[PDB]
C-alpha cells in the first residue's frame, strides 16, 4: 500500500514490484 | 476588499511575550516563579485592552534558553540540560526549594522539556469563574469599598515554576525562560480608547498625563 | 519519505497528556474482572456523603471528638447564637477537612449548593427551636438573631424532628468560587441562634450536644484539578 | 412626546433620537443566564422610574463632571434601600441630562456613558481614594490642569486624558450623544446590563460611569443669562436583587 | 515505523503559526456564554465609529481640550482658509491618535474613503457658509478658495446643516496606500475655506468653534498586521 | 458539568513515583528499584482515596545527567545512552554494571539515548486478583505472625538502571525519574482522605494529629 | 503516538525542493489582479523572437 | 554560528537559539538585543533552535 | 484538510475562516 | 478515534 | 493534491 | 491497523493476534 508523494518519476521507489 | 485580517481573531492571534525570567543551575534555591498577569507588558497589554471583556483559549509557548556562565573548573563539558516548568492553580502547595515534594505535579500539570528541541507549547482553556475575561474593573476587592482598587482584585490566575531538571553540573549553567501567549478562539466585547499614556503599573491604570496627539506649527500647516 | 513539519510541543512531556503508547507486556492476559461493590465513578459521588463538621474548633476539641459537639444549653436569654462559621468550604478549618473540603482541595474552583444537617443528641425529653441562617456576603457576620432573621434561613424544632437539614443555596455573582479564599468569590456566613430556649423536665440533663453534617447538592462540580495542600513530604518514606 | 416611567414622565422630547447604549434594550436576567438560585425581587415601579440626582454649574471654565452610576443611586429611594439589602443587583438605566441656554449662547457638551471606568491615580504608586472616585448625589469634576504628584489618593483628573490614560477625543466608542446648545436641550441613553458576569455587588462595583465634558465652552455675549445650569436624571430600569440579609453601606 | 522524511520548517516556532496543541487542562468545563452587549467581530467595527479630530495641534492646545476646537470668527474677509491637513489617516499628529490612526497604526496597508463629520458648536443665531475641500495630490496644498475650488469639494451652510459629512473619496493610484509618510502613496490636503463670511446679530458672540470626526466608510480596509510604534517599554510594568 | 471529577480525569496525570541516581565510575554504578506506589506522598494519598482500583499504566522516564568532578585535561563527552531493564519477580538480577542479565533476551527494557524526547511505555492490569489493593487488614503468614499490611501483597518486581556507553576520563552522574499515569481507571469502596503525614512506605503507620485547623470561638468569622 | 520512521534526507534543505510552508501573513488580503499587456509563460516565447546578430564582433 | 576567540578558560556552550524578527514599514524598530519590540506582539518572528 | 487530533476544543487552530 | 496497537493498555484515557 | 495549509500561499509550485 | 509500508514480508509485524 504504497503511493507516490512527489511530482517527479525520478523521486519514486525502485521497480521491485 | 475584504476586511478579513481585521478580525479580532487575526488582531489578536500572535504569539507574543508576556514575562520572562531566569533561574541557575546549582545555586541554592534555583527555582523561578511568576504570577499569572496580562499586564506586565506593553503590546499585548494594548491589544487586549482595546476591548474591555474578553473570552478566549490560549496557546502557550515557551522558549527557554540557557548559556554558560563562569567557572574555575578546566574544560567543562555540558551534558544536555533539561527543564520543568510547574503550574500551581491558586491554592495548591508552592516549592520553596529546587528539591521540594511539590515537583511531583501528581496533579498539578507541568511540562519535561529538553533543550535543543522543538520549543514546548500548549493550549489551555477558558479558566474564568464569570462569563468572560475582565480587562478592567471599576470596583475594589472589599464589600466595604475598601482595601484594593482595580483589576488585581479580580487576577487570581495561579503561579508558574520553572527548574532545571538537570543539576549539579562542574560549571554554572544560567537559563531564561520566555513565555508567550497566543489567543485562539477570541470573543470581544465593549470596545473602549486605545491606551494613550505610557503604562506605569501593572496592577492598576494608574497613567501620567501626557498630550492628546503631536503638535504642528499651525492650523493650515502640510 | 513522507514530506513532514515538526511543530512546536514536539519533545515534550506533558503531565496531563493523553497520547497512546507501545505497551511492554503485548498479548498480557489480564486476569477477568469482578463485580466489586462500591464502584466509584465520580469524586462528587463522595463529596455527596454527609461527614461529621468539627464547628468547635477550639485548640482543646481539635485533638478529640469534642470538636464535633456544638454545645447547647438551658438558658435564661433570648436569641443567644449558637455558632457561626463562614461558608469556606475549602478554606476554613470547620469544612476545609470535611469530606467535601478534603475533595475541593483538589481543585481550584467550586460552584453549587451545600446540605448541613444538624442532629439534635439530647436526651429525648428536651424540648427547643433554633434559626438556621445563612447570610449572603457583604453585611457582616449577623450579630444577633433580629439580623439572621432578615437572611436566608429556617425554624429548627428540635422536639418535632430530631434531625433538620438546612440547604444554603448557590447565591454568587459569579458561576463558580475560588476554594481558596478571595474576598471577590465571598461566600456568606451561616450561624445559629436559639428561637426559644432548651426546656428540660425535673431529673434530666439541661446540657445537650448538636452534630453538624456537611455534603453537596445536586447541583455542585469542581474545575481546574490541582494538588492538595495537606499532604506534603520531606524525604522519600521508606 | 414623552417618556413616561414609573411615576415619573420627563417629557423633554422633540422628534430627536435615544442612543440606545450598544443597541440593547435592558432587559431582565434570563433563566439561562443566571446562577443565583433564590428568587430575584423586582421592585418594578417603586425602583424602575426617574431619580433625578443634584445639578451642577456649567461655567466657561468647566472641565467636565462624571458620576459612578450605582453610587449616584446609592441613596435615592428605595432602588437605594434594596441596594442596601441585597448582596446582588442587575440594572439598566435610561439617563437624561438636561441643559437648555438661549439661542445667543453658545457651547456643546459631550454626554458619554463608560462601561468600567477604572480610574487612574497622580501618585502611580496607590490607587485612588474611594471618596475621590466617588460622589454621592454630588458629581465629581475633572480639572483643567494635571493634578500634582505629592497628592498620596487622588484621581488623575486632566481632562484630556478621561482620568483613563486614553484620548478624551476617543470617548465617543462608549454610548454617547452630543448637547449642541445651538441645536440641542438634552440627550438620552439608554443603557443596558454590561458586566462580565449575570449579577454582581452594587457598593463593589460600580458598572458605569457617567461622563459630561464640555467640548467647546459655553460663551454668551454680556446680558444674557449667566447661569447656565446642567441637571442629570437618572431611572433604573428591569432592576433584579438576589441575596437578602441585612444591610450596610 | 511508517516512513518519513521532515522538510525544513521542522522544530520551528513561527510567531504567527496556527498548529493545533495538546490541553493541559483536559475536560475542563468552560463557564458557560452569556450574551454580553457590545459584541465585536472586525476592529473595522471601531475604525467606523466616529472620533474627535484635534485639528488644533498647537503645542498650546494639545494638552487641553482646546486642541479639538476649530476656531471660526466673523471676518472682513472671504476665503481666509479655516483648517488644512494632509490627508494621512496614520502619519499626521492630525489623525494617527484618532480611533481610525490607532486602529490603522497597526496594519501597513490601508485603502478606502473616509468620514469628516464637521458640527457647528456656535450660537443658534450665527449664519454662514464655508468650503470642504479635499484636493488630490499633485499640486501643492490648495493656496486660495479659487485653487482648493477645483478639487472635491463641499459648499456648507451653517444654519440649516449644523452638521455636515464629507465623504473624502479613495482616489489613488494603487489599490492600497501605506500607513506610514510615503511621496509614492500621497494622499492629498483637507481644506477649509469662507465660502460666505459668519453673520451674527447684536449681543450674541461673534467667535465660534467647530468639531471634527473622523470615521471610515464602507469601503475600508486594512492589511499586513504589525506592532504600533506608540506603545514603549523599557522595563517589565508591576 | 462534573467532567473533570472523574475518577479517570483525577488519576490520569503523570506523577514523579521514584528517582534514584547512578554514576558512570565503578562496577556498581547502576540503580535499582522496587516497584512501589508508596515512596511519594501526592500519588499515594490520591490512591488512598479508595480501597480498590484496577487500570493501566503509561510510564514516562525523565532522565538528567550530570557532569561530576575531575582532574584530567578536556573532559569531551560524548551522548550518553541508558538501559531501563524491568525484572519480573524471580528473574535473574544484574550484580555489576557488566552482568549477563542486561542481554534481556526477555525481561523488557528500553534503550533511550539523552537529548530526545523522554521515553515511555505501557503496562496493562498486572495484577494476580481481580484488583489492586490500597489497603491489606491481615498478614502474609496463616499463623497471623511475620508481616501485617499491604507489603504482603505488593510483588511487582524490580527496575534496574544503567548507563550502556563506556565510561571515559571524566564521571557522570545521572537521575532517573519515574513517572506513572494510570490509565484506564476503575475504583472501589472510597475510604477517608489521609489525614496524618506518611511515615512509612510499608504500613499505615502514622503518628496522630488534630481533625482540622484552628479557631478561637464556634463564633470566630 | 503514530510509528514513524525518518528516512534519510529529513531537515535537509535542497534548493529545489517543492515543499508547502506556513504563511507567516495569515488571511492576507491580497490585491487583486490586473490584465498587464504581454504577460510571459515560458522563456521560450523570449528565445523565438529575433534579436540582431552581432555577426562583426571585430574588437573595433 | 561560530566559536570566536575568547580569552577565558573552558567555553562550554550550550544550544544557541536565535530570533528573526520582521518590522513591517512604520513599527517600532529594535534599538537594542534586549528591546520591548522583541515581544512581536503583532510583528511576525521565528524563533528557531541551532542543529535543526 | 483540517482534521483535529485532540479530545478538547481547546487544542483546536484558530477560527481563522 | 483510532487505535494504532493490539494491546488495550496502549490506548489513551477513557475520555 | 492535499493542502495541509489555510493560505494558498502556502501551496507548492504550479508546475502541472 | 490494517497496513504495511515496505515491499518485503520479513519488514511487518510479529503475528501477535
Ligand atoms: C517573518 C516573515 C517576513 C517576510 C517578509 C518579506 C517580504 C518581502 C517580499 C519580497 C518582494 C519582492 C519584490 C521584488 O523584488 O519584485
Not at chain 1, 518519476?9 to 525502485?14: D, L, V
Not at chain 2, 488582531?11 to 514575562?19: D, I, M
Not at chain 3, 461566600?187 to 434530666?204: E, F, K, L, S
Not at chain 4, 429611594?77 to 453658545?106: D, E, P, W
Amino acid at each position: 500500500t504504497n503511493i507516490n508523494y512527489y511530482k517527479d518519476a525520478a523521486s519514486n521507489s525502485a521497480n521491485r514490484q | 476588499h475584504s476586511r478579513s485580517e481585521s478580525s479580532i481573531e487575526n488582531f489578536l492571534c500572535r504569539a507574543a511575550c508576556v514575562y520572562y525570567a531566569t533561574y541557575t543551575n546549582n545555586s541554592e534555591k534555583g527555582y523561578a516563579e511568576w504570577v499569572i498577569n496580562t499586564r506586565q507588558v506593553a503590546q499585548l497589554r494594548r491589544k487586549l485592552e482595546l476591548f474591555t471583556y474578553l473570552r478566549f483559549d490560549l496557546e502557550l509557548t515557551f522558549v527557554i534558553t540557557s548559556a554558560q556562565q563562569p567557572s574555575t573548573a578546566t574544560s567543562v563539558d555540558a551534558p544536555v540540560q533539561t527543564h520543568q516548568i510547574m503550574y500551581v492553580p491558586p491554592g495548591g502547595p508552592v516549592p520553596t526549594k529546587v528539591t521540594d515534594y511539590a515537583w511531583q505535579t501528581s496533579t498539578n500539570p507541568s511540562v519535561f522539556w529538553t533543550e535543543g528541541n522543538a520549543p514546548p507549547r500548549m493550549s489551555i482553556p477558558f479558566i474564568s469563574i464569570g462569563n468572560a475575561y475582565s480587562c478592567f474593573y471599576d470596583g475594589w476587592t472589599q464589600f466595604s469599598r475598601n482595601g484594593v482598587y482595580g483589576i488585581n482584585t479580580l487576577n487570581n490566575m495561579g503561579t508558574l515554576y520553572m527548574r532545571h531538571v538537570n543539576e549539579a553540573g562542574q560549571g554554572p549553567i544560567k537559563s531564561t525562560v520566555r513565555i508567550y501567549f497566543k489567543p485562539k478562539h477570541v470573543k470581544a466585547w465593549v470596545p473602549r480608547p486605545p491606551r494613550l499614556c505610557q503604562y506605569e503599573k501593572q496592577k492598576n491604570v494608574n497613567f501620567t498625563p501626557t498630550g492628546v496627539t503631536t503638535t504642528r506649527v499651525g492650523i493650515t500647516t502640510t | 519519505g513522507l514530506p513532514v513539519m515538526t511543530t512546536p510541543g514536539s519533545t515534550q512531556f506533558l503531565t496531563s497528556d493523553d497520547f497512546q503508547s507501545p505497551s511492554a507486556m503485548p498479548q498480557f492476559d489480564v486476569t477477568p474482572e469482578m463485580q466489586i461493590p462500591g464502584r466509584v465513578n465520580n469524586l462528587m459521588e463522595i463529596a455527596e456523603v454527609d461527614s461529621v463538621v468539627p464547628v468547635n474548633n477550639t485548640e482543646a476539641n481539635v485533638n478529640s471528638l469534642k470538636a464535633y459537639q456544638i454545645p447547647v444549653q438551658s438558658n435564661s436569654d433570648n436569641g443567644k447564637q449558637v455558632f457561626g462559621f463562614p461558608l469556606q468550604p475549602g478554606a476554613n478549618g470547620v469544612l476545609n477537612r470535611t469530606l467535601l473540603g478534603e475533595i475541593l482541595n483538589y481543585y481550584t474552583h467550586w460552584s453549587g449548593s451545600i446540605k448541613l444537617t444538624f442532629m439534635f443528641c439530647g436526651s429525648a425529653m428536651a424540648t427547643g427551636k433554633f434559626l438556621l441562617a445563612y447570610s449572603p456576603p457583604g453585611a457582616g457576620v449577623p450579630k444577633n438573631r433580629k439580623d439572621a432573621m432578615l437572611g436566608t434561613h429556617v425554624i429548627w424544632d428540635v422536639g418535632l424532628q430530631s434531625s433538620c437539614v438546612l440547604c444554603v443555596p448557590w447565591i454568587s455573582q459569579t458561576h463558580y468560587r475560588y476554594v481558596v479564599e478571595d474576598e471577590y468569590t465571598a461566600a456568606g456566613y451561616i450561624t445559629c441562634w436559639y428561637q426559644t430556649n432548651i426546656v428540660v423536665p425535673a431529673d434530666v440533663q439541661s446540657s445537650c450536644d448538636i452534630l453538624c453534617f456537611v455534603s453537596a447538592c445536586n447541583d455542585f462540580s469542581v474545575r481546574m484539578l490541582k494538588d492538595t495542600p495537606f499532604i506534603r513530604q520531606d524525604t522519600f518514606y521508606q | 412626546r414623552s417618556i413616561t416611567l414609573g411615576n415619573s414622565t420627563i417629557t423633554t422630547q422633540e422628534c430627536a433620537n435615544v442612543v440606545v447604549g450598544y443597541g440593547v434594550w435592558p432587559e431582565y436576567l434570563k433563566d439561562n443566564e443566571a446562577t443565583a438560585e433564590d428568587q430575584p425581587t423586582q421592585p418594578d415601579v417603586a425602583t424602575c422610574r426617574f431619580y433625578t440626582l443634584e445639578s451642577v454649574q456649567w461655567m466657561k471654565n468647566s472641565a467636565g463632571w462624571w458620576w459612578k452610576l450605582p453610587d449616584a443611586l446609592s441613596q435615592m429611594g428605595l432602588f437605594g434601600q434594596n441596594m442596601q439589602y441585597h448582596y446582588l443587583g442587575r440594572t439598566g438605566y435610561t439617563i437624561h441630562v438636561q441643559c437648555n441656554a438661549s439661542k445667543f449662547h453658545q457651547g456643546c457638551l459631550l454626554v458619554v456613558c463608560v462601561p468600567e471606568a477604572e480610574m487612574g491615580c497622580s501618585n502611580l504608586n496607590n490607587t485612588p481614594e474611594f471618596a475621590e472616585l466617588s460622589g454621592g448625589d454630588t458629581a465629581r469634576m475633572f480639572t483643567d490642569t494635571q493634578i500634582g504628584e505629592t497628592n498620596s489618593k487622588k484621581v488623575q483628573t486632566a481632562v484630556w486624558n478621561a482620568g483613563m490614560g486614553v484620548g478624551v477625543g476617543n470617548l465617543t466608542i462608549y454610548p454617547h450623544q452630543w448637547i449642541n446648545l445651538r441645536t440641542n436641550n438634552s440627550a438620552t441613553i439608554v443603557m443596558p446590563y454590561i458586566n462580565s458576569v449575570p449579577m454582581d455587588n452594587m457598593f463593589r462595583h460600580n458598572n458605569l460611569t457617567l461622563m459630561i465634558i464640555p467640548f467647546v465652552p459655553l460663551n454668551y455675549s454680556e446680558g444674557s443669562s449667566p447661569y447656565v445650569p446642567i441637571t442629570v436624571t437618572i431611572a433604573p430600569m428591569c432592576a433584579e436583587y438576589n441575596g437578602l440579609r441585612l444591610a450596610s453601606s
